[PDB]
């Protein structure tokens, strides 16, 4: 496979962002990582045949590397907890710096792309489409947490972020009273997704493993927990006039890679027709 490892400078973050890339078309699928994003390889390349599955698909595949517990958003400040010496500015990187770099050097279009996220980034992909519709007319959320500002979610997200690398949710979106919590809440931003007529692909398993694996307590628990939010998202979406979505809620699936890969393959034809055909 013709996969490349690029060093894309982030002026806003003051460092270079490693990006795994496979060409094949002017339009691309941005594959966002999960909560435990690593600094060597994006989770999709480590756990799935993503690049192979999209080889010769008429689409380019972009895999940013890094961003553990970042939620791919622009933080208010450095994480006050683990000595992070810079401020995450992933929204700026994904909507300005990276696309500019890829257009100049590779010819990848800055508009008409797809943002695909899972777990931590499932909602992130949706928010990106919400505020950058020209760049993301398509967005997929796989097992995402779609109502981050509601009830216990801010607290659960805070513990998860601290548990994964010691990141501070308050450094990111500030106090739960801060506008950022609602600004980045997919549920709250549904009207934008409808108004922009975003093509959305929302998936979430039910907690029961199939032959695909992912059979462990944590993975089963997470999927069953977030499914409640995903169903409320589908309802509110339809109630708000949403008419361009695909909601896959099968009676199987845990919070793990085999299932996310299965969805990535399932949505390929969908992305091809929306972005190209």
Point out the annotated binding site for substrate. 35-36, 119, 147, 225-228, 232, 255-257
- As given in the structure block, the two tokens for residue 59 are 């689409």
CA neighbor of 115 nearest in space, from 55, 32, 38, 46: 32
Catalytic entry in 10, 69, 70, 119: 119
Resolution (A): 2.3
Examine the residue annotation and report whether 223 is marked as an active-site residue of this protein.
Answer: yes
- DSSP tag of 108: -
Rounded distance between C-alpha atoms, residue 128 and residue 182, angstroms: 14
CA neighbor of 123 nearest in space, from 107, 149, 142: 142
The phi, psi pair for 49, rounded to 5°, reads: -90, 35
Whether the CB-CB separation of 239 and 258 falls below 8 Å is answered with no
Rounded distance between C-alpha atoms, residue 91 and residue 214, angstroms: 30
3-state DSSP call for residue 91? helix
The phi, psi pair for 199, rounded to 5°, reads: -85, 115
Rounded distance between C-alpha atoms, residue 99 and residue 254, angstroms: 33
Q: Which domains does the chain have, with CATH numbers?
A: 1-277 (3.40.50.1820)
Examine the residue annotation and report whether 70 is marked as an active-site residue of this protein.
Answer: no
Catalytic entry in 70, 121, 141, 255: 255
Rounded distance between C-alpha atoms, residue 173 and residue 88, angstroms: 11
Point out the annotated binding site. 35-36, 119, 147, 225-228, 232, 255-257
Rounded distance between C-alpha atoms, residue 268 and residue 238, angstroms: 24
Identify the helix (H) or strand (E) that includes residue 171.
helix 169-173
Rounded distance between C-alpha atoms, residue 75 and residue 79, angstroms: 8
> 3-state SS of the chain: helix, strand, coil percent to 5?
40, 15, 45
- As given in the structure block, the two tokens for residue 176 are 């739960």
CA neighbor of 117 nearest in space, from 183, 206, 29, 216: 29
Question: Regarding beta strands 138-142 and 3-10, do their DSSP bridges make them parallel or antiparallel, or are they unpaired?
Answer: unpaired
How many Cβ atoms from other residues are within 10 Å of residue 58's Cβ?
14
Q: How was this entry determined?
A: X-ray
List, in order, residues 6 or more apart from 143 with CB less than 8 Å away.
Answer: 118, 119, 122, 203, 204, 205, 222, 223, 226, 230, 253, 255, 259, 260
Q: What is the CA radius of gyration of the chain?
A: 17
* Degrees, nearest 5: CA angle 168-171-177: 105
Catalytic entry in 79, 97, 171, 223: 223
CA neighbor of 68 nearest in space, from 155, 164, 168: 164
Burial of 184 (0-12, 13-18, 19+ CB in 10 A): buried
């Amino acid at each position: 496979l013709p996969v490349e490892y690029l060093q894309v400078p982030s002026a806003s973050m003051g460092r270079d962002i490693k990006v795994q890339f496979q060409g094949g078309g002017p339009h691309a699928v941005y594959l966002l990582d999960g909560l435990r994003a690593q600094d060597d390889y994006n989770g999709w390349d480590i756990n799935t045949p993503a690049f192979e599955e999209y080889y010769q698909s008429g689409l380019s595949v972009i895999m940013p590397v890094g961003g553990q517990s970042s939620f791919y958003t622009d933080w208010y400040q450095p994480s006050q907890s683990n000595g992070q010496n810079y401020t995450y500015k992933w929204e700026t990187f994904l909507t300005r710096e990276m696309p500019a770099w890829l257009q100049a050097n590779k010819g990848v279009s800055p508009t008409g792309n797809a943002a695909v996220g899972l777990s931590m980034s499932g909602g992130s992909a949706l928010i990106l489409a919400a505020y950058y519709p020209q760049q993301f007319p398509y967005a997929a959320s796989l097992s995402g947490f779609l109502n981050p500002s509601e009830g216990w979610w801010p607290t659960l997200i805070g513990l998860a972020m601290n548990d994964s690398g010691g990141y501070n949710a308050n450094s990111m979106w500030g106090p739960s009273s801060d506008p950022a919590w609602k600004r980045n809440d997919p549920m709250v931003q549904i009207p934008r997704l409808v108004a922009n007529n975003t093509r959305i692909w929302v998936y979430c398993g039910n907690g029961t493993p199939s032959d695909l694996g992912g059979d462990n307590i944590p993975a089963k628990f997470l999927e069953g927990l977030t499914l409640r939010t995903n169903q409320t998202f589908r309802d509110t979406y339809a109630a708000d006039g949403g008419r361009n979505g695909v909601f896959n809620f099968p009676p199987n699936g845990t919070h793990s890679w085999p299932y996310w890969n299965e969805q990535l393959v399932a949505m390929k034809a969908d992305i091809q027709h929306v972005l190209n055909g």
